[PDB]
PDB file of all heavy atoms in Angstrom:
ATOM      1  N   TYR A  33      58.726 161.472  55.835  1.00 24.27           N
ATOM      2  CA  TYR A  33      59.603 162.470  55.183  1.00 24.27           C
ATOM      3  C   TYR A  33      60.175 163.361  56.255  1.00 24.27           C
ATOM      4  O   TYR A  33      59.538 163.582  57.294  1.00 24.27           O
ATOM      5  CB  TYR A  33      58.819 163.357  54.228  1.00 24.27           C
ATOM      6  CG  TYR A  33      58.218 162.673  53.047  1.00 24.27           C
ATOM      7  CD1 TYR A  33      57.119 161.825  53.209  1.00 24.27           C
ATOM      8  CD2 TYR A  33      58.722 162.859  51.768  1.00 24.27           C
ATOM      9  CE1 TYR A  33      56.578 161.166  52.108  1.00 24.27           C
ATOM     10  CE2 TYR A  33      58.179 162.221  50.681  1.00 24.27           C
ATOM     11  CZ  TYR A  33      57.118 161.371  50.860  1.00 24.27           C
ATOM     12  OH  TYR A  33      56.570 160.720  49.768  1.00 24.27           O
ATOM     13  N   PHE A  50      66.078 178.650  51.837  1.00 34.13           N
ATOM     14  CA  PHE A  50      65.017 178.032  51.080  1.00 34.13           C
ATOM     15  C   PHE A  50      65.542 177.552  49.744  1.00 34.13           C
ATOM     16  O   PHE A  50      66.565 178.068  49.236  1.00 34.13           O
ATOM     17  CB  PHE A  50      63.880 178.983  50.804  1.00 34.13           C
ATOM     18  CG  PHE A  50      63.196 179.495  52.031  1.00 34.13           C
ATOM     19  CD1 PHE A  50      63.702 180.553  52.763  1.00 34.13           C
ATOM     20  CD2 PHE A  50      62.034 178.882  52.480  1.00 34.13           C
ATOM     21  CE1 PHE A  50      63.068 181.016  53.909  1.00 34.13           C
ATOM     22  CE2 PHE A  50      61.403 179.324  53.628  1.00 34.13           C
ATOM     23  CZ  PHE A  50      61.893 180.415  54.337  1.00 34.13           C
ATOM     24  N   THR A  51      64.845 176.573  49.186  1.00 35.07           N
ATOM     25  CA  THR A  51      65.099 176.140  47.805  1.00 35.07           C
ATOM     26  C   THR A  51      63.898 176.436  46.948  1.00 35.07           C
ATOM     27  O   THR A  51      62.793 176.618  47.434  1.00 35.07           O
ATOM     28  CB  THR A  51      65.400 174.636  47.676  1.00 35.07           C
ATOM     29  OG1 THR A  51      64.173 173.892  47.832  1.00 35.07           O
ATOM     30  CG2 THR A  51      66.442 174.162  48.626  1.00 35.07           C
ATOM     31  N   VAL A  52      64.122 176.530  45.637  1.00 35.37           N
ATOM     32  CA  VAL A  52      63.064 176.493  44.671  1.00 35.37           C
ATOM     33  C   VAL A  52      63.191 175.169  43.927  1.00 35.37           C
ATOM     34  O   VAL A  52      64.251 174.849  43.371  1.00 35.37           O
ATOM     35  CB  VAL A  52      63.096 177.687  43.700  1.00 35.37           C
ATOM     36  CG1 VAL A  52      61.949 177.576  42.696  1.00 35.37           C
ATOM     37  CG2 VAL A  52      63.046 178.997  44.466  1.00 35.37           C
ATOM     38  N   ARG A  53      62.109 174.395  43.952  1.00 34.20           N
ATOM     39  CA  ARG A  53      62.087 173.101  43.260  1.00 34.20           C
ATOM     40  C   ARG A  53      62.192 173.296  41.762  1.00 34.20           C
ATOM     41  O   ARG A  53      61.617 174.230  41.207  1.00 34.20           O
ATOM     42  CB  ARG A  53      60.796 172.326  43.561  1.00 34.20           C
ATOM     43  CG  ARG A  53      60.743 171.828  44.987  1.00 34.20           C
ATOM     44  CD  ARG A  53      59.361 171.269  45.332  1.00 34.20           C
ATOM     45  NE  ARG A  53      59.047 170.025  44.645  1.00 34.20           N
ATOM     46  CZ  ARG A  53      59.465 168.813  45.011  1.00 34.20           C
ATOM     47  NH1 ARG A  53      60.253 168.633  46.071  1.00 34.20           N
ATOM     48  NH2 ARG A  53      59.104 167.751  44.289  1.00 34.20           N
ATOM     49  N   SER A  54      62.934 172.410  41.127  1.00 32.78           N
ATOM     50  CA  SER A  54      63.078 172.453  39.674  1.00 32.78           C
ATOM     51  C   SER A  54      61.715 172.374  38.986  1.00 32.78           C
ATOM     52  O   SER A  54      60.817 171.693  39.469  1.00 32.78           O
ATOM     53  CB  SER A  54      63.942 171.297  39.194  1.00 32.78           C
ATOM     54  OG  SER A  54      63.699 171.107  37.808  1.00 32.78           O
ATOM     55  N   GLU A  55      61.591 173.063  37.856  1.00 32.62           N
ATOM     56  CA  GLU A  55      60.360 173.033  37.062  1.00 32.62           C
ATOM     57  C   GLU A  55      60.139 171.661  36.402  1.00 32.62           C
ATOM     58  O   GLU A  55      59.026 171.371  35.959  1.00 32.62           O
ATOM     59  CB  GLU A  55      60.373 174.143  36.001  1.00 32.62           C
ATOM     60  CG  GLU A  55      60.412 175.569  36.546  1.00 32.62           C
ATOM     61  CD  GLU A  55      59.114 176.042  37.199  1.00 32.62           C
ATOM     62  OE1 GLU A  55      58.076 175.334  37.160  1.00 32.62           O
ATOM     63  OE2 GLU A  55      59.123 177.158  37.753  1.00 32.62           O
ATOM     64  N   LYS A  56      61.183 170.830  36.349  1.00 33.09           N
ATOM     65  CA  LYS A  56      61.117 169.466  35.795  1.00 33.09           C
ATOM     66  C   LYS A  56      60.470 168.433  36.714  1.00 33.09           C
ATOM     67  O   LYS A  56      60.137 167.333  36.258  1.00 33.09           O
ATOM     68  CB  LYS A  56      62.531 168.958  35.462  1.00 33.09           C
ATOM     69  CG  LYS A  56      63.208 169.655  34.290  1.00 33.09           C
ATOM     70  CD  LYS A  56      63.145 168.825  33.009  1.00 33.09           C
ATOM     71  CE  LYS A  56      64.107 169.343  31.951  1.00 33.09           C
ATOM     72  NZ  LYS A  56      63.734 170.703  31.469  1.00 33.09           N
ATOM     73  N   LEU A  57      60.334 168.744  38.001  1.00 35.11           N
ATOM     74  CA  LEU A  57      59.856 167.755  38.968  1.00 35.11           C
ATOM     75  C   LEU A  57      58.361 167.548  38.791  1.00 35.11           C
ATOM     76  O   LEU A  57      57.643 168.480  38.423  1.00 35.11           O
ATOM     77  CB  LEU A  57      60.171 168.185  40.396  1.00 35.11           C
ATOM     78  CG  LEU A  57      61.663 168.311  40.748  1.00 35.11           C
ATOM     79  CD1 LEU A  57      61.821 168.725  42.196  1.00 35.11           C
ATOM     80  CD2 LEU A  57      62.430 167.021  40.492  1.00 35.11           C
ATOM     81  N   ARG A  58      57.911 166.316  39.037  1.00 34.74           N
ATOM     82  CA  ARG A  58      56.502 165.942  38.858  1.00 34.74           C
ATOM     83  C   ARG A  58      55.627 166.565  39.953  1.00 34.74           C
ATOM     84  O   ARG A  58      54.554 167.091  39.666  1.00 34.74           O
ATOM     85  CB  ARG A  58      56.346 164.411  38.821  1.00 34.74           C
ATOM     86  CG  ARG A  58      55.090 163.920  38.101  1.00 34.74           C
ATOM     87  CD  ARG A  58      55.336 162.668  37.256  1.00 34.74           C
ATOM     88  NE  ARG A  58      55.275 161.423  38.030  1.00 34.74           N
ATOM     89  CZ  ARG A  58      54.158 160.761  38.358  1.00 34.74           C
ATOM     90  NH1 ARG A  58      52.948 161.206  38.004  1.00 34.74           N
ATOM     91  NH2 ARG A  58      54.249 159.632  39.060  1.00 34.74           N
ATOM     92  N   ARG A  59      56.107 166.542  41.193  1.00 33.29           N
ATOM     93  CA  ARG A  59      55.378 167.118  42.330  1.00 33.29           C
ATOM     94  C   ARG A  59      55.894 168.524  42.654  1.00 33.29           C
ATOM     95  O   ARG A  59      57.096 168.719  42.818  1.00 33.29           O
ATOM     96  CB  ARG A  59      55.501 166.198  43.545  1.00 33.29           C
ATOM     97  CG  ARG A  59      54.846 164.845  43.297  1.00 33.29           C
ATOM     98  CD  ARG A  59      55.135 163.827  44.386  1.00 33.29           C
ATOM     99  NE  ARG A  59      54.671 162.488  43.999  1.00 33.29           N
ATOM    100  CZ  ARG A  59      54.829 161.377  44.723  1.00 33.29           C
ATOM    101  NH1 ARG A  59      55.447 161.407  45.903  1.00 33.29           N
ATOM    102  NH2 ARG A  59      54.363 160.217  44.261  1.00 33.29           N
ATOM    103  N   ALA A  60      54.980 169.491  42.680  1.00 31.03           N
ATOM    104  CA  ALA A  60      55.248 170.866  43.091  1.00 31.03           C
ATOM    105  C   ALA A  60      56.409 171.543  42.338  1.00 31.03           C
ATOM    106  O   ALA A  60      57.299 172.140  42.963  1.00 31.03           O
ATOM    107  CB  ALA A  60      55.479 170.905  44.602  1.00 31.03           C
ATOM    108  N   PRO A  61      56.400 171.490  40.989  1.00 30.26           N
ATOM    109  CA  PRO A  61      57.501 172.122  40.282  1.00 30.26           C
ATOM    110  C   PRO A  61      57.505 173.616  40.538  1.00 30.26           C
ATOM    111  O   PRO A  61      56.449 174.235  40.631  1.00 30.26           O
ATOM    112  CB  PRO A  61      57.196 171.828  38.810  1.00 30.26           C
ATOM    113  CG  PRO A  61      55.718 171.712  38.766  1.00 30.26           C
ATOM    114  CD  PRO A  61      55.312 171.085  40.071  1.00 30.26           C
ATOM    115  N   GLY A  62      58.689 174.200  40.694  1.00 28.93           N
ATOM    116  CA  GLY A  62      58.797 175.638  40.877  1.00 28.93           C
ATOM    117  C   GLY A  62      58.425 176.203  42.247  1.00 28.93           C
ATOM    118  O   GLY A  62      58.506 177.413  42.434  1.00 28.93           O
ATOM    119  N   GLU A  63      58.021 175.355  43.183  1.00 28.29           N
ATOM    120  CA  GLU A  63      57.578 175.816  44.515  1.00 28.29           C
ATOM    121  C   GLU A  63      58.792 176.057  45.420  1.00 28.29           C
ATOM    122  O   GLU A  63      59.793 175.355  45.321  1.00 28.29           O
ATOM    123  CB  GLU A  63      56.651 174.802  45.199  1.00 28.29           C
ATOM    124  CG  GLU A  63      55.175 174.915  44.820  1.00 28.29           C
ATOM    125  CD  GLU A  63      54.245 174.081  45.717  1.00 28.29           C
ATOM    126  OE1 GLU A  63      54.622 173.638  46.837  1.00 28.29           O
ATOM    127  OE2 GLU A  63      53.106 173.841  45.283  1.00 28.29           O
ATOM    128  N   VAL A  64      58.627 177.012  46.343  1.00 29.24           N
ATOM    129  CA  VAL A  64      59.600 177.244  47.408  1.00 29.24           C
ATOM    130  C   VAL A  64      59.412 176.194  48.487  1.00 29.24           C
ATOM    131  O   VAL A  64      58.307 176.005  48.974  1.00 29.24           O
ATOM    132  CB  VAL A  64      59.490 178.664  47.987  1.00 29.24           C
ATOM    133  CG1 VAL A  64      60.366 178.821  49.216  1.00 29.24           C
ATOM    134  CG2 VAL A  64      59.870 179.702  46.927  1.00 29.24           C
ATOM    135  N   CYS A  65      60.470 175.460  48.820  1.00 28.47           N
ATOM    136  CA  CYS A  65      60.430 174.450  49.865  1.00 28.47           C
ATOM    137  C   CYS A  65      61.726 174.414  50.622  1.00 28.47           C
ATOM    138  O   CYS A  65      62.752 174.877  50.147  1.00 28.47           O
ATOM    139  CB  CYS A  65      60.254 173.027  49.315  1.00 28.47           C
ATOM    140  SG  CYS A  65      58.915 172.761  48.245  1.00 28.47           S
ATOM    141  N   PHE A  66      61.684 173.825  51.794  1.00 27.63           N
ATOM    142  CA  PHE A  66      62.871 173.516  52.543  1.00 27.63           C
ATOM    143  C   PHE A  66      63.539 172.274  51.956  1.00 27.63           C
ATOM    144  O   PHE A  66      62.848 171.405  51.405  1.00 27.63           O
ATOM    145  CB  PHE A  66      62.596 173.324  54.021  1.00 27.63           C
ATOM    146  CG  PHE A  66      62.208 174.589  54.724  1.00 27.63           C
ATOM    147  CD1 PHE A  66      60.937 174.783  55.241  1.00 27.63           C
ATOM    148  CD2 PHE A  66      63.133 175.624  54.881  1.00 27.63           C
ATOM    149  CE1 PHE A  66      60.597 175.971  55.882  1.00 27.63           C
ATOM    150  CE2 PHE A  66      62.791 176.809  55.497  1.00 27.63           C
ATOM    151  CZ  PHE A  66      61.520 176.986  56.014  1.00 27.63           C
ATOM    152  N   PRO A  67      64.870 172.125  52.129  1.00 25.46           N
ATOM    153  CA  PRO A  67      65.491 170.861  51.721  1.00 25.46           C
ATOM    154  C   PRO A  67      64.934 169.675  52.522  1.00 25.46           C
ATOM    155  O   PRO A  67      64.506 169.852  53.670  1.00 25.46           O
ATOM    156  CB  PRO A  67      66.989 171.052  52.056  1.00 25.46           C
ATOM    157  CG  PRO A  67      67.163 172.480  52.360  1.00 25.46           C
ATOM    158  CD  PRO A  67      65.854 173.105  52.650  1.00 25.46           C
ATOM    159  N   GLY A  68      64.947 168.502  51.917  1.00 24.64           N
ATOM    160  CA  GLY A  68      64.472 167.300  52.620  1.00 24.64           C
ATOM    161  C   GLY A  68      63.907 166.296  51.638  1.00 24.64           C
ATOM    162  O   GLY A  68      64.030 166.422  50.414  1.00 24.64           O
ATOM    163  N   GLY A  69      63.233 165.281  52.184  1.00 24.21           N
ATOM    164  CA  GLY A  69      62.692 164.256  51.346  1.00 24.21           C
ATOM    165  C   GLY A  69      62.287 163.018  52.095  1.00 24.21           C
ATOM    166  O   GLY A  69      62.230 163.008  53.323  1.00 24.21           O
ATOM    167  N   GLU A  85      69.209 164.105  52.350  1.00 16.53           N
ATOM    168  CA  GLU A  85      68.516 164.795  51.282  1.00 16.53           C
ATOM    169  C   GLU A  85      69.064 166.211  51.054  1.00 16.53           C
ATOM    170  O   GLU A  85      69.166 166.642  49.913  1.00 16.53           O
ATOM    171  CB  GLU A  85      66.979 164.810  51.513  1.00 16.53           C
ATOM    172  CG  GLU A  85      66.349 163.418  51.454  1.00 16.53           C
ATOM    173  CD  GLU A  85      65.908 162.968  50.054  1.00 16.53           C
ATOM    174  OE1 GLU A  85      65.637 163.785  49.191  1.00 16.53           O
ATOM    175  OE2 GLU A  85      65.809 161.762  49.838  1.00 16.53           O
ATOM    176  N   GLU A  89      70.601 167.660  47.525  1.00 18.47           N
ATOM    177  CA  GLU A  89      69.927 168.753  46.914  1.00 18.47           C
ATOM    178  C   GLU A  89      70.777 170.025  46.807  1.00 18.47           C
ATOM    179  O   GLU A  89      70.693 170.711  45.803  1.00 18.47           O
ATOM    180  CB  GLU A  89      68.599 169.054  47.660  1.00 18.47           C
ATOM    181  CG  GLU A  89      67.557 167.958  47.419  1.00 18.47           C
ATOM    182  CD  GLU A  89      66.546 167.770  48.530  1.00 18.47           C
ATOM    183  OE1 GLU A  89      66.530 168.613  49.458  1.00 18.47           O
ATOM    184  OE2 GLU A  89      65.799 166.741  48.443  1.00 18.47           O
ATOM    185  N   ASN A 130      71.804 171.207  43.063  1.00 42.69           N
ATOM    186  CA  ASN A 130      71.718 170.117  42.049  1.00 42.69           C
ATOM    187  C   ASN A 130      70.611 170.496  41.062  1.00 42.69           C
ATOM    188  O   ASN A 130      69.440 170.461  41.413  1.00 42.69           O
ATOM    189  CB  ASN A 130      71.449 168.744  42.707  1.00 42.69           C
ATOM    190  CG  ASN A 130      71.048 167.634  41.722  1.00 42.69           C
ATOM    191  OD1 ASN A 130      70.915 167.808  40.490  1.00 42.69           O
ATOM    192  ND2 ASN A 130      70.836 166.459  42.278  1.00 42.69           N
ATOM    193  N   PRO A 131      70.955 170.900  39.814  1.00 45.01           N
ATOM    194  CA  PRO A 131      69.944 171.470  38.943  1.00 45.01           C
ATOM    195  C   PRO A 131      68.845 170.522  38.471  1.00 45.01           C
ATOM    196  O   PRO A 131      67.793 170.982  38.043  1.00 45.01           O
ATOM    197  CB  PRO A 131      70.761 171.994  37.747  1.00 45.01           C
ATOM    198  CG  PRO A 131      71.975 171.170  37.747  1.00 45.01           C
ATOM    199  CD  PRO A 131      72.270 170.791  39.164  1.00 45.01           C
ATOM    200  N   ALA A 132      69.056 169.221  38.605  1.00 41.01           N
ATOM    201  CA  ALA A 132      67.953 168.279  38.316  1.00 41.01           C
ATOM    202  C   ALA A 132      66.833 168.400  39.345  1.00 41.01           C
ATOM    203  O   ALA A 132      65.684 168.074  39.048  1.00 41.01           O
ATOM    204  CB  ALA A 132      68.464 166.848  38.256  1.00 41.01           C
ATOM    205  N   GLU A 133      67.154 168.904  40.544  1.00 40.10           N
ATOM    206  CA  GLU A 133      66.187 168.999  41.652  1.00 40.10           C
ATOM    207  C   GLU A 133      65.883 170.407  42.113  1.00 40.10           C
ATOM    208  O   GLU A 133      64.771 170.685  42.537  1.00 40.10           O
ATOM    209  CB  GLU A 133      66.746 168.225  42.819  1.00 40.10           C
ATOM    210  CG  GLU A 133      66.804 166.725  42.500  1.00 40.10           C
ATOM    211  CD  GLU A 133      67.486 165.892  43.537  1.00 40.10           C
ATOM    212  OE1 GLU A 133      68.168 166.440  44.412  1.00 40.10           O
ATOM    213  OE2 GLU A 133      67.353 164.642  43.463  1.00 40.10           O
ATOM    214  N   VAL A 134      66.883 171.277  42.042  1.00 43.18           N
ATOM    215  CA  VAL A 134      66.822 172.593  42.680  1.00 43.18           C
ATOM    216  C   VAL A 134      67.127 173.650  41.625  1.00 43.18           C
ATOM    217  O   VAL A 134      68.236 173.666  41.077  1.00 43.18           O
ATOM    218  CB  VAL A 134      67.843 172.702  43.860  1.00 43.18           C
ATOM    219  CG1 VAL A 134      67.837 174.094  44.479  1.00 43.18           C
ATOM    220  CG2 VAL A 134      67.510 171.674  44.941  1.00 43.18           C
ATOM    221  N   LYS A 135      66.159 174.529  41.408  1.00 40.46           N
ATOM    222  CA  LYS A 135      66.267 175.660  40.483  1.00 40.46           C
ATOM    223  C   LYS A 135      67.013 176.837  41.101  1.00 40.46           C
ATOM    224  O   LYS A 135      67.686 177.599  40.403  1.00 40.46           O
ATOM    225  CB  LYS A 135      64.875 176.137  40.083  1.00 40.46           C
ATOM    226  CG  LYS A 135      64.898 177.298  39.120  1.00 40.46           C
ATOM    227  CD  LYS A 135      63.634 177.384  38.294  1.00 40.46           C
ATOM    228  CE  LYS A 135      62.462 177.841  39.115  1.00 40.46           C
ATOM    229  NZ  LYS A 135      61.610 178.745  38.297  1.00 40.46           N
ATOM    230  N   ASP A 136      66.862 177.030  42.412  1.00 39.38           N
ATOM    231  CA  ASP A 136      67.410 178.219  43.052  1.00 39.38           C
ATOM    232  C   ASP A 136      67.519 177.949  44.549  1.00 39.38           C
ATOM    233  O   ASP A 136      66.874 177.038  45.051  1.00 39.38           O
ATOM    234  CB  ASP A 136      66.470 179.410  42.791  1.00 39.38           C
ATOM    235  CG  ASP A 136      67.112 180.770  43.037  1.00 39.38           C
ATOM    236  OD1 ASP A 136      68.293 180.871  43.404  1.00 39.38           O
ATOM    237  OD2 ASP A 136      66.371 181.764  42.808  1.00 39.38           O
ATOM    238  N   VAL A 137      68.388 178.701  45.208  1.00 40.71           N
ATOM    239  CA  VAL A 137      68.546 178.709  46.677  1.00 40.71           C
ATOM    240  C   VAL A 137      68.583 180.162  47.075  1.00 40.71           C
ATOM    241  O   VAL A 137      69.252 180.998  46.446  1.00 40.71           O
ATOM    242  CB  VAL A 137      69.824 177.963  47.110  1.00 40.71           C
ATOM    243  CG1 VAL A 137      70.041 178.057  48.624  1.00 40.71           C
ATOM    244  CG2 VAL A 137      69.795 176.499  46.719  1.00 40.71           C
ATOM    245  N   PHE A 138      67.925 180.518  48.166  1.00 40.75           N
ATOM    246  CA  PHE A 138      67.956 181.878  48.616  1.00 40.75           C
ATOM    247  C   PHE A 138      67.726 181.969  50.114  1.00 40.75           C
ATOM    248  O   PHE A 138      67.190 181.012  50.715  1.00 40.75           O
ATOM    249  CB  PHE A 138      66.928 182.733  47.871  1.00 40.75           C
ATOM    250  CG  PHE A 138      65.485 182.378  48.141  1.00 40.75           C
ATOM    251  CD1 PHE A 138      64.753 183.106  49.069  1.00 40.75           C
ATOM    252  CD2 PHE A 138      64.870 181.309  47.494  1.00 40.75           C
ATOM    253  CE1 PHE A 138      63.420 182.811  49.302  1.00 40.75           C
ATOM    254  CE2 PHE A 138      63.522 181.005  47.738  1.00 40.75           C
ATOM    255  CZ  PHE A 138      62.814 181.749  48.658  1.00 40.75           C
ATOM    256  N   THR A 175      55.601 175.358  54.234  1.00 27.41           N
ATOM    257  CA  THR A 175      56.912 176.064  54.223  1.00 27.41           C
ATOM    258  C   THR A 175      56.776 177.410  54.925  1.00 27.41           C
ATOM    259  O   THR A 175      57.541 177.720  55.844  1.00 27.41           O
ATOM    260  CB  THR A 175      57.393 176.225  52.784  1.00 27.41           C
ATOM    261  OG1 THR A 175      57.600 174.910  52.237  1.00 27.41           O
ATOM    262  CG2 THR A 175      58.733 176.975  52.724  1.00 27.41           C
TER     263      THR A 175
END
Side-chain angles (χ1 to χ4, degrees):
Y33 295 72
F50 298 82
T51 75
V52 180
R53 290 170 69 81
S54 161
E55 297 288 354
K56 291 259 194 294
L57 297 181
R58 203 141 83 83
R59 296 171 189 177
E63 275 191 17
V64 172
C65 307
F66 291 113
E85 294 271 335
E89 289 152 9
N130 167 359
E133 293 173 346
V134 177
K135 180 156 72 142
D136 197 1
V137 176
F138 66 98
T175 297

